[PDB]
Design a protein around this ligand. Structure first.
Ligand SMILES: O=C(O)[C@H]1O[C@@H](O[C@H]2[C@H](O)[C@H](O)[C@H](O[C@H]3[C@H](O)[C@H](O)[C@H](O[C@H]4[C@H](O)[C@H](O)[C@H](O[C@H]5[C@H](O)[C@H](O)[C@H](O)O[C@@H]5C(=O)O)O[C@@H]4C(=O)O)O[C@@H]3C(=O)O)O[C@@H]2C(=O)O)[C@@H](O)[C@@H](O)[C@@H]1O
Ligand SMILES: [Ca+2]
Ligand SMILES: [Ca+2]
Ligand SMILES: [Ca+2]
Length: 487
């Protein structure tokens, strides 16, 4: 699998998920270098805590590396690619990247989704593998202790969460229970689904969506305002983690491991590992998947789904003096041996090739830490350009977790996600000038609403004014225009 005759050292700026950078001595990166003869060296800031700021600051310094990578960079790969900071990959892929060329061959909608208005491919994306993403999970051992049954609608959800709060299910005499926790703060806004309001059109938070041939953004609709009215009341009543916006990554380890949380919306595989992982420290701990409790409008909504392609990956800068070797290095991660390490880690360390496929073995499968959390720490399952393989995830999907997935599929609960729109140069330019600005202001207002710093009703009108003056509806007009060119 070597691509270059002499070892090639490339500078990567890859800051992702507000917590991590590329490591040259990751066991997977050490194995990457070993298989490809291409070494990557991180120039990103270790200690920094905002991946988008780091990309921006890097762009602002004029000092680019050879490779830029990370999560949530699709819009910037496209915008700065058109400006000439990243090179178009079309001819390189066609001539030097066969596995990628074969992937786009059998995945034409992926290649279309990641392209720029000028028709150029400016990064290689992270391609997820799977169907469902998040579901709802509740403490059945608390339900049992309190003599409750799983909630079937929002009315019963409220009653059950109230009981977790008020009737001491951990039995320590203290009102320490925190009914709803989530390691992703944006899930608190997705709670508006339970009153029949969208929070996002996709697995990307605050995403647009299509409603009957009309592009909308969910946080602009009156339905969102009404939903936030109940969400704010829940926060006020202490049903939602007071620290929901600041606890973040390790909220499961903290709130479940400390026997404080009763309820969450998270991924099936990893969340269900905690039953085993906490089996000794919290005797009797048992999370179960439940169907989405029927919302106030009489429907069961699972808004989240696995994406066909995520807005993450890596790109080749103009400064890169070895574009050919780099694109071959990219191609490695769409080949079977690249998929092997990027999904499974290091052979003889986390997996072996058994019957022609990577099979994990048992030190990893039984860790109290979910398998994908272990793989991050060694450089696998990271948002480079690589073709994820659901076989890696099936191997640590417990039977109880699998029964949840099957329930959600059978039940039809998973709403189809927004696949995107193909804008023109002018349309996407308006999108570039306004959306990030609008998205930030939206988040700050909702955090305010959830926490009770501002009232939803009393600020809704001035909110809609800001939406209009900051260009939200002009962005919508341009997306609709591009949607109409497809419909
Ligand atoms: O666990 C399993 O069962 C399965 O997990 C699968 O991997 C999932 C993980 O479970 C998580 O879902 C992971 O979430 C990532 C996500 O991909 C994004 O990278 C997201 O990006 C957020 C940024 O890190 C940052 O927090 C950002 O802050 C915003 C802020 O929200 C607000 O907008 C403000 O105005 O602006 C800031 C800003 O950036 O300036 O928010 C981003 C966002 O909006 O969410 O970060 C999370 C994360 O966990 O950190 O995604 C992976 C995945 O691969 O998709 C998978 O491994 C599967 O196989 C497992 O079975
Ligand atoms: Ca899929
Ligand atoms: Ca208690
Ligand atoms: Ca602007």
């Amino acid at each position: 699998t070597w691509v270059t005759d002499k070892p090639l050292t490339l500078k990567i700026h890859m800051h992702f998920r507000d917590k991590w950078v590329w490591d040259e001595n990751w066991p997977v990166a050490k194995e990457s270098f070993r298989l490809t003869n291409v070494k990557l060296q991180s120039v990103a800031n270790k200690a920094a805590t905002n991946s988008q700021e780091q990309f921006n600051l890097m762009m602002a310094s004029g000092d680019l590396p050879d490779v830029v990578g990370g999560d949530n960079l699709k819009d910037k790969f496209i915008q700065y690619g058109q400006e000439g900071a990243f090179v178009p990959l079309n001819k390189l892929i066609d001539q030097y990247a066969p596995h990628i060329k074969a992937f786009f061959k059998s995945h034409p909608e992926v290649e279309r989704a990641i392209k720029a208005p000028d028709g150029n491919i400016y990064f290689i994306p992270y391609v997820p593998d799977g169907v469902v993403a998040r579901g709802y999970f509740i403490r059945e051992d608390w339900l049992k202790k309190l003599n409750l049954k799983p909630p079937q609608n929002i009315d019963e959800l409220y009653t059950v969460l109230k009981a977790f709060k008020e009737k001491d299910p951990n039995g320590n005499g203290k009102a320490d229970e925190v009914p709803f926790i989530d390691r992703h703060p944006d899930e608190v806004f997705r709670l508006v689904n339970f009153w029949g309001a969208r929070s996002s059109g996709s697995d990307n938070y605050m995403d647009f969506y299509i409603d009957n041939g009309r592009v909308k953004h969910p946080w602009a609709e009156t339905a969102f305002r009404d939903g936030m009215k109940h969400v704010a009341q829940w926060y006020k009543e202490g049903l939602i983690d007071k620290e929901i916006f600041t606890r973040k990554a390790k909220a499961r380890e903290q709130m479940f491991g400390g026997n404080l949380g009763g309820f969450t919306h998270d991924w099936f595989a990893s969340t269900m590992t905690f039953n085993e992982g906490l089996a000794k420290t919290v005797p009797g701990f048992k999370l179960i998947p439940i169907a989405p409790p029927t919302n106030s409008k009489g429907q069961r909504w699972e808004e989240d789904s696995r994406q066909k392609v995520r807005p993450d990956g890596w790109a080749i800068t103009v400064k890169n003096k070895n574009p050919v070797e780099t694109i071959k290095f990219f191609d490695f991660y769409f080949s079977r041996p690249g998929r092997d390490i990027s999904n499974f880690g290091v052979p003889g360390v986390t997996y072996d090739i058994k019957n022609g496929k990577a099979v994990f073995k048992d030190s990893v499968l039984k860790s109290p830490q979910p398998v994908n959390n272990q793989l991050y720490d060694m450089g696998a399952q990271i948002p480079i350009g690589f073709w994820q393989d659901y076989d890696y995830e099936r191997q640590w999907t417990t039977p109880e977790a699998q029964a949840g997935i099957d329930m959600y599929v059978k039940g039809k609960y998973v709403m189809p996600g927004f696949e995107g729109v193909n804008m023109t140069r002018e349309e996407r330019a308006i999108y570039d000038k306004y959306w990030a600005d609008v998205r930030t202001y939206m988040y700050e207002m909702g955090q305010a609403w959830v926490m009770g710093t501002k009232d939803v009703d009393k600020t809704w009108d001035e909110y809609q004014r800001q939406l209009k003056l900051r260009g939200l509806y002009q962005v919508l007009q341009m997306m609709q225009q591009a949607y109409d060119r497809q419909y």
